[PDB]
Every structure is written in C-alpha cells, then in structure tokens.
Amino acid sequence: AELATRAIPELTKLLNDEDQVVVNKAAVMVHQLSKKEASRHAIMRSPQMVSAIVRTMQNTNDVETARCTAGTLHNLSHHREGLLAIFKSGGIPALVKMLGSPVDSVLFYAITTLHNLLLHQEGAKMAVRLAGGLQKMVALLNKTNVKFLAITTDCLQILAYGNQESKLIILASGGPQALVNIMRTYTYEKLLWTTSRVLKVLSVCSSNKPAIVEAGGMQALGLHLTDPSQRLVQNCLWTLRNLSDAATKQEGMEGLLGTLVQLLGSDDINVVTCAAGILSNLTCNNYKNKMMVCQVGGIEALVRTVLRAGDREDITEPAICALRHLTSRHQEAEMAQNAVRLHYGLPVVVKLLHPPSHWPLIKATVGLIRNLALCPANHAPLREQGAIPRLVQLLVRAHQDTQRFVEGVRMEEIVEGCTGALHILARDVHNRIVIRGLNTIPLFVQLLYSPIENIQRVAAGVLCELAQDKEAAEAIEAEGATAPLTELLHSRNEGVATYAAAVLFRMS
Template identity: 35%
Template sequence: VYSEAVSKMSTFRSSYREATTPTGASAAAGPVNFSASLDRQSVSMDTLNRQMHRGRAVRVRQALFPETVGAEAEQMAGLETLTRGRRRLPTSVQQLAEPAQILRTAVVNLINYQEDADVALHAAAELARLLGSSDPVTCQRAASLTLQLSKKQACRLAFAVQVDLIEALLIVVQTAQSVEALRFAVGALCHICQAEQGCATVYQCGRVRAVPELLRLLGSTDVRTRNYALTCLHHLLVHLEEVRNEARMASGAQVLSELLLSIVSTSWQQASVSSPPPPMSPPLSAASTGSGSEAQQQQQKLMAVCIDSLQLLAFANQESKLVLLSCGAVDQLVNLLLTSRYEKLLFSTSRLLKVLSVEPSCKSAILAAGGMTALGRHLKSTGSERLVMNVLWTIRNLSDQAFTLNQPLDQLLVDLIGLLASPDIDCVTCAAGILCNLTCRNRRNKFVVTSSGGAGALSQTLLAAQDREEIAEPLMCALRHITHDHEQACAAADAVLSHGLACTLGELLHRAAVVADATTVGVGVSVANDEPGGPAASRPLVKAALGLCRNLSLHAAGRAALHAESVPAAASAIAAATLARGIDALLDDAGSIASAGGADDGVRAEEVLEAALACLHSLAGEGDGETDPIEARRQRDAVAAAVRSRPGLPDSVAELAAGGVVGSSCVGPAGDLLERLATANAATGSTSATLQRRPAVELTDEQQQQRHLSDRSSVLDVPDVSVRPYRYDPERSGATLPVNYAAQLPPSYHTYQQEQQLQPEPPQHWYSTAKI
C-alpha cells in the first residue's frame, strides 16, 4: 500500500511540472508572474461592480425620470439578466416604475397648481381694473387673458371668489362694443361657472343680472358667443334652484325652445348637404356612441345641453311644459329619438320627455307624434343603461293613455315581456306597470301579450316577486286583464293555473281575510311583517287578486283550483267584514260608503267589496262545500241582517248589501231582492236580477217577467259612468248580461269595458322616480 501511494505521488508531481513549465513563446517570456494575474482579476471585478452600480442607477432614473435617460439605457440593457435571474421575473425597480411615475406627476401637478392659483389670485385685481378700461383694445386683451387663465382649474377656482372680477366681466358682457371682447368675457364666465362657488358668485352679483343677459345672448349671431352663453346658463341652472325660477320669469323656456328648433333645423340642413340621413337610425349600441362629422357632433352636443336646460326649467313647473308644447318642441324631441345616435342627446331627450309625460296635454301630443314607437326602439340599447331606464319611465307615464292608440305596439310588448327577466328590480317594476296599462281595455294588446308567452312570464315573475308589492300589484293587474275578453283568454288562464298561481292567490286572500275579520275595517290595514302568514296586502293588491280569481273561476279548472285553496271562504270574509264596516260608517257619518276606512293607495273599501262580490258571483257556480259552516253562517247572518234591517239605505249601498248574499249561498233575503227588481236604479235592479239567477230561487211567472224586463233595460241602457264613478265594471258587466239577450247588444258593446286602469301616482309611489 505504501509503495502504491508513493508511485501516485510521483506521478502527480511530474504532471504538475509539465503543466507549469512554459513551452515555446511562453518559455522565452520567462517564468509566470502570479501576482500580476491576481491584479488583473481584481481590476476586472472592480470594473464589473462599477458597471452593475451604474446600470442600477440608470434603471432607477429610467423609472423616475425617463426623459433624462437616452442611449445609456440601451447599453445597460444587457446587465438586466444579472438581476432578473433565470426566470426573468420583473425586478423591484421595474415593479415600482409605474407608481413612481404617478407620484412624480402628482407632485409636479401640485406644484404647478399652486403656482397657477397664486398667479390668478394676484392677477384678479389687475384684470378687473383693465376690464373696466375705456380703451376697447385694453378691455379686449384683458378679457382674452382672463379667458386663457380660466381654462385652468386652479385659476378658475381662484376667480370664483373674486366678486370684482366677475362684476367686471358681466359689465363687459352688457356693454361690449366688439364681438371678440363679448366672446372672451362670456367664455371666461362659462369656465368660472363650472364650479358651484363660481355659479353662486355670478348669480349674486347685484350690479348686472346674469340670467337675463345670458338669455339675450342666446339669440346672438356669433355661434361661439351663443354656445358660451348656453353652456354658462346650463351650469347656473344645474347648480342653483333660484336661477331656474328667474329664468322662468324671464321667458327662458320659450327662448330655449326657439334655440332648440333653430339648432335642429341647422343640423338637418348640414346633414342633408353632406349626406342625407336615413329616416330612422338603428338603436344605440355600445360601439356607436356618436355619428356624423365633427360639425354635426358639435351640433348634437349643443342640442343635448339645450334640452337638458329645458328639462331643468320644465321640472315641476306646468307653465314651462305648456310653453314647450305651444312652441312645437314635442315633435322635434320625438324626431330626435328616431334620427340621432348620440347617447347624451338621446339621454337628455328621454329625460325631458319623462318630465313632459306627466302633463295630460303634453302626454297626448307625445302619443300623437309617435312617441311610443320612438321610445320603444331604445329598449334594446346596449350602450347605455341610463337611457333604457329613462325610456322605461317615460313609457310608463304614457301607458295610461297609450292603450287607446290604434297603432300597433307588438314589438314594444314583446320587448317588455323580455324585460321581466331582467335582474334590475327597477326595470322589472317599470315593465310590469307598462304591461298592466297597455293591456287595459285593449283586446289586441292582450292577444299579443298572451301569444308571446306573456302569461307565463308574468306568472313566473309574480311567483318570484310576490313579497314585493310594488311589483306584485301591476303583475296581478296585468294577469287580470289578459285572462278575459279576447281570443286567447282561455290560454292565458291555463298558463296562470299551470304555474301554480292559485295557491299564491289563496294565501294572499286568506291573509287579507284574517286582517279584515280582526279589524272589521276591510283590507289594507298594516300589520307586522313577522306574522306567521306573512305581511298583509294592501287594498290595490287584494282588489287585483280578487279580479284575477273572478276571471279564473269562469273556467271549470280554475273554479276547482280556487275551491281547493278555499278562496270562496276568504272572499266571503272580506266581503262580509268590509260591508259591515261600510254600513256602520254610512249610518254614523251620513256619508257615502267611500268614507268607510278611507282610501288606501287610491283604492277605497267599496271597490274591494265589489271585487269580492264579483268573485263570489263566479265562484257560486259550484257548491260552497269547502267553506266552514260556522264561518258561512256568520257571513250569511251579517249580510242578511244588513239587507233586512236597513230598508232606507241609498241605492248604491243597497246594491252592495244585496250582492253579499251570493257568497254564502243563503236564500233568506230573496224577498228583498225581488222587491229591488222594480227599483228605478238600473244598477241595483241589474245586480238583484243577477243574484236571483244564482241562488236558484223559485219565482212566479210575474216575478220572472219582472226580472226579464229588468235585465233587458239594465243591459241595453248602460248606466252613465258619472252616476256610478267607482263601479268595478269588468266583473259586474259579466254578471249582468242575460243569456238570451246577448244577440241584442250593439256590435260596439263589449262585455268587460272598464277594466281597472293604473293611473300615474304621486312621486313617492312606485310609478315615478322624481317629483315631476
């Protein structure tokens, strides 16, 4: 082992000598200098370190001050691999580059902002003095400098509190001799009024009133001066309520209307010269927010500002709305909806139409100009949700008269049905209210809604939103409308029943019956929301539910489903309790039954009572075996006592009291009903005759003839609505039609002529979004 180790050591030494011994040119140079080699290595390391430090500095400067780094950054780009590593992840400096740039820009802007504010503050007094100079050139140059400074935010805010400067500008506006000086002064005021403080200072200047002067300048021949004046006036109207009142007193609505007509006329002339626009533009989409040349877009912007100013003046002011109507602005607004694709213009137009749509005369003008069709085109606008909502509210306000239109609204109805599935609760609320109104007394609209799957969509939405009464009420009314008096009424009723809506109706009416029986004041009494059965419904919702039950009970399947849910018992309880309370209040107050319980959201106790009795008329076609005998006896005794013990009641109250007999299928008051057949009141005689057919009372030949004549006179001589202004005619008309006299009715007479119509409510109701 030892000899083997010695051999290896000698071999290693010989190999080392060969490696370290210089050969050829190296031998001639002499022995190797190891110290010099080490010095060269240390120098190269120092150079590399300096390059790395310099590269780091370049990257930092490039991140913070990129404008100071030129070709040096490209030379140092190769050193990034030393710091980024093999995975080539961004360095810390690179990650901080963007925030550092934002911080640097903010600091620079802050420094410049403070400098601008200081300059404007010191220059305001001197500019005010120069604006009051008698030299027109000096005044014009001062106005020009003021305009240039006011374009900067810091200077604008500094000028907003300088009363002397603003007064000097207003004086120049009033007394300027040159067009340029006037334009510069109005432009400076326009920029100053972008701030609310500037608007307040301009309005409070006592020497010159700004609003009349701006209205005067709207008729200027200089386009830029007119544009500045319009924009400045718009800023004042937006920020200050006092300016709106002053502008109304100065005929601002008329001046702005004339300006709008002038701008529209000029815009159409320019468009016709360049390229004639299509008669109807496509709906707005996300990719099309403007169209036309730059001049046309500028005209559209001015129209948007003018229309928004008119909206501010017409808001909550009937006189301004009538001025707009008399100037012919309504037709132009509808035309803009058909031809424009500029989103801001469409939005402003829809807002103004929403304000005008609550005025009856303006509402008729909008409908006559084709407003429903023009508005309906923008329900599918994907580029602006605010436009869609304003269009919906406008259509909602118009829909209480639009159901009388002869023009087809098929596409609008289909779009509204689709909006019922929207996740936006406001959109669903508006769509439900519009469908409710448009299907009122319009057989074509009912047919279109039913044929387009509207019954199923309304039922599904009602099941999903039955706890939200602001949505459930119009949905219930719309279902009540489409389930009778048109060709697809049976299909609509089948769709409602197939969605299990009978159970929902039964639960709602039972809750209302419990409240009515406990308070003896009718339905609509507020109760705690944590009741076992859920919150109590208001009178409008209960009235609509009773009407829907009445329509469903016209079919055998509907009657069976409603009897299974004990709807007759609930309707009887509502009718008995409401009628009992109504008669007591009538005898105590010597008034009408409308005073009983007051009005709940515009629906009185009398209307709910009529709806309940009409529902019972239809449900009486089958036995009342589902009703509890004790409850039925209590109801029967209450109604019979009311009829027998109150012989001196007015005809309207007697008619309602007689109608209560049907719900409990009692024949006790049959004599009273027979006596009322000969009454002079057509409504009372008609209802009494109908009730006599339902209980199957044995009548003599003389009584049969008397009932026959009463039926004929009641149907052919329809009572004047002014005599009975609160009748629930859909149910009552269906109950009073004699079977053997249907052919004698005039062709224009329909069975259910007066459905419940959803009228516009005060702003706090779900129909409106603003105090219009």
C-alpha cells in the same frame, strides 16, 4: 396676482372701449386674461371688468368679439365668485340673448355658463325664467352636437323640476316633441339619460303627458329599454309608467310590449314593478295589446312574476291587474284563462285573497278569478283551491261594512266583484252545491235591494244560475225574492231585468 390684482385697474381700461374695433382688440385680450388662472382670479376679484365684459358682449355685432367675451364668462364660470360676478353683472339675460345667436361657438360658452350658474349660484333658476331662457333652450334642442344637447337638456331639467310653470312653458315651446326626437335619433347615453330625466319630470304633469304620448314618447322610450346603462332604462321605465294611462290609443307598441314582458323576468325589483305597471295600463281597454302580450308569452311571464313577488303588493297588484285584462274581451282570452292554470297560477291567485293582502290587491284578484272562471276547465281547480268559501266571506264582510272607503277601495266594489265571480263559478253544478251550502241565497236576495245597478245584476245572475236546481229554486222563493224580482223586471239596466225574468220563470 402680481400682473393681476395690480393688473386689474389697468385691465379695466385695458377693457372698456367706446370705439368698435378697439374693444374688439381688447376682448381678444381679455380672452387671454381668461385663459390664465392668475389673471382670471383677478377678473373674478373686481366686479367692474365683469360688467364691462357682459356689456360689450351684448353690444358687439361681430362674432369673434362675442366669442372671446363669452369664453371669458365661461372661464369665470369655473370660479364660484365668477358666478356671483355674472350674477351682479346681469349676464343671465345677456347669456339668454345669445341662445338665439347662430354661430355655434358662442352658444357653447353661453349654455355652459348658464349651466354652471344654475348648479352653483343661488336664485339662478329664477333669473333664467325671468329672462325667458326656457323658451330659448327648447328652441336649441334642434341643434346636433350631442355635448351641447346634453347641457341644454340638463338646464331644462334643473329648471323644470319642482316648478309647474316651467313645465307648462316647455309644453308651450313644443318641448315634448323636441325631447322625444332626441330620444329617437341619438345614441349618446349622457344626452339620452338627461333627456329621459326631463321627460320624467314632464311625465307627472297632467298637460305634458298627453303631448309626450302624442309625439310618440312611449315608442321612443321603448327603444332604450335594452340599453346596458341601468340609469337610462330605469328612467325610461319610470317615465313610461307615468304616461301609460294616456297611451291606450297609441299603436306600434309591438316592440315595447315584447321588451316589457322580458323585463318581468329581470332581477331588478324596480324594473319588474315598472314593467308590470306599464303592461297593466296598456292592456286595459286595448284588445290589440292584449293579443300581443299573450303572443309573446306574457301570461306565463306574469304568472312567474306573481309567484316570485310573494308578499310584495307593489308587484302583484299590477301583475294581477294585467292578468285580469288578458283574460277577457280579447280573442285568445280562452287560451289565456287556460294558460294561468297551465303555469300553476290558480293556487297563488286564491292565496292572494287571504291576508296579508290589502284591499286593492284583493279587488284585482277577485276580478282575475271572475275571468278565469269563464273557462270551464278552471271551475273544478278553483273550487279545489278554496276560492268559493273565501269569496263568500269577503262578500259577507264587505256587505256588513256597506250597511253600517278602505284602502281607497269602496266595499261596494268588493260586494260587486265577489258576487260577479260567484255568478260565473255558479255555472258548474258542484260550485252551486258549495255556494248553496254556505247559505248565501239570503244575502243574494238582500243584494237585489241594493241601489247599485251592477250589484243587482250580479245578484240576480247568481240566483238565476242557482235557480236551475229545484231545491235552490224553492229556497229563493221562500227567501221572499219573488217581490224584488218583480221591481227588477222594470229596470233601466237590461241585465238586471233579464236575470230577474229568468229566476221568476225557474220558480214554478
């Protein structure tokens, strides 16, 4: 402090210059005063010099002058008050101006001083947003030095988190495409981890997610699922899960789907839950993805996941959902329906219909059972496992709650799913004796009166399979169903009209 606090008032003049080349010789001096801790603890001390360093750094059109001036601000950026000094000096907009400067060295001090400001200075995020640094940071994502890219992506992450307007600016600045490029072309873990944190923050925005998917983000995140760094894989999995609902059109997912299946066998419950969630979303409405997941043993892996998960519905509900997807509208679905049985899946699926399972899990499980029932080799084991009495009790109770949303599930979807499962199970003659013995024919006739056209179709279809037996056909008639079936014959839904025509013919 000798040649410091006391060296401050001279430095002031040992700083401010009006010439051109003179300040220059002063700035390279102030850099030397920045390299010594004693003299920079004096630069931090009085705010006059700090405003002059910031001013002349804006004024200078010489690269060397701008470097020592920024390196000074960098050395002040290690001090807590140095931050407060740059805040008073208004350097944040000045530092932003150099995010477009070309020489690398000045970019590296500026993005670091802004970084330390965003971490330890209050209100710094608001100042960088006002200065338009967000758009300048996204443009900097094309540079090549990984240590510089790791700081810039962190600045964007601190700014975008919790701020929807900052996310929309990153979108408008082409951020999604730039961040995805960083994930495809670099191997440095610190940068890849930070970039995935940015994409994770952008993944929850309704506007950013389609663009990230469009840029190939699903495939880019897939490349790092095999990385030994847990924080990198986990953030990639969290990001993949948020975008997976918008990636049903993407192709080239063969590698991702194969890695996702292996991740199901993982011991990390967060890894397993995410992989089950991504696979469930990507297998929806995508016959090619259904084929690939089945081609890498995905049914066997999912059945093992549901068995290992037990009572945790964070794992079973997506894994059941994915299983219901892989068992319908898809080429090797008949082999997938058998595969569930072959891997001892039928007992655990029926179990998930009983408590303590919550309604969303029950919805997927009933849907899974309809698809498994399409395979005749599953008719007898599904009956032996007690599926028919339980589906009937769920249907009866759900129908009373409709006459008089639970867990986000409308009971009319329980009514429809349970009647649909019984419709396919009723193809087997022994299931029809069980369904008939439960005195379900009444309820099925009531469902013909239901307003939902899908509930009318499953109700008429199950009565149609039942009406092929003589004893049952008389019971449907005695139930008075001949009259609703007449109004059903003239329905906008074909399926409602044809099933009603079949039962009517079976009653003779």
